[PDB]
Amino acid sequence: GYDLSASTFSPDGRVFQVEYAMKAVENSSTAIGIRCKDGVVFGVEKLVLSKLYEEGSNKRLFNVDRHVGMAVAGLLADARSLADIAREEASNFRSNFGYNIPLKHLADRVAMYVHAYTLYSAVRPFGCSFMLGSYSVNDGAQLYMIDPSGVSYGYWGCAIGKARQAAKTEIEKLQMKEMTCRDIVKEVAKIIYIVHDEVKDKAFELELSWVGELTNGRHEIVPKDIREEAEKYAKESLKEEDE
């Protein structure tokens, strides 16, 4: 069983091109998402490849809907395609049924789209893994992760990209279920800075956002002041650890 098509099973019953898509996924910088008690906070270790780009020139945080925001990791082209697909899924859901799409349903639909692409050999699996986050008064705060194979799983704190394991340990060192978003933002900034590999990537920017009750179940980029405060918290944490 070769690995040149998603329609071919390995002798081990293992589709290899999906695993190669995942390998492409764990080459992007990093993206953490923490589900607090009253919201979800996304953070991305947006690596500024060159100083010529503008801050926010490669936004890996997209607004899939009013209440749903996704953080992507992997191929940005595939991530943008999946963001457009999720946007149209949410729009179609609202137009057909008349209310905001539940995050679980949207994640299931997009994951099934990803599976549709990982099934056949006429196409290739998406080379990006993404996290969806939303908050609603009647459904709480929800965070899901979908990978190139099309596996949508709910999480309390998830990490994708290169340092997903390090981010996972840093997240496990938290009482996420009982914290507030205003503090989980600082914790996410700290985790991004800890898992960032300065000697390996050097240049670095932190792209944050949350969707929570303080935003009335609406996904927004973190205000500049809050983002700066979280970045300062991460810097001082790194300084203290060094000392």
Binding site: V199, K200, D201, K202
Partner: protein
């Protein structure tokens, strides 16, 4: 890796590998002799050889990043008659997936390119030409591109 075959197989090399496996981690502990192996393809190696206790620190050497490539350029250019205007960061950005020796080859071929004329300089044109001739891109007449 070992395999099951009903007609022929690499049994002698498999036996030698088995002896190596037992020496690394077998009946008689040998805790005073340390072992470092090196390879380009672990997908080939046998699972019994990669297990913990035989080779536990399975280090992976990555493609050098931009800064790593610049550092390799400098390491292999320290002993040459280097011009004082060399944007090693520009050279690293141009390299673009030059893996190992490739950077040393850039330096060596830049030196050769200088040696054609005869001089004491590289001026980040000899290195540009060295990168061009180490990319090994086959000649083409694609000058009709926009």
């Amino acid at each position: 890796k070992r395999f099951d075959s009903e007609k022929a197989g690499d049994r002698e090399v498999q036996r030698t590998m088995l002896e190596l496996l037992n020496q690394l981690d077998g009946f008689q502990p040998n805790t005073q002799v340390k072992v470092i192996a090196a390879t380009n393809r672990v997908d080939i190696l046998d699972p019994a050889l990669l297990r913990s206790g035989r080779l536990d620190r399975k280090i992976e050497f990555p493609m050098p990043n931009e800064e790593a490539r610049a550092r390799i350029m400098q390491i292999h250019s320290r002993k040459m008659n280097v011009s004082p205007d060399v944007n090693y960061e520009e050279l690293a950005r141009c390299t673009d997936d030059f893996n190992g020796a490739q950077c040393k080859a850039v330096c060596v071929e830049a030196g050769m390119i200088a040696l054609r004329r005869g001089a004491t300089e590289l001026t980040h044109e000899d290195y540009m030409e060295g990168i061009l001739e180490v990319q090994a891109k086959k000649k083409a007449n694609l000058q009709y591109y926009a």
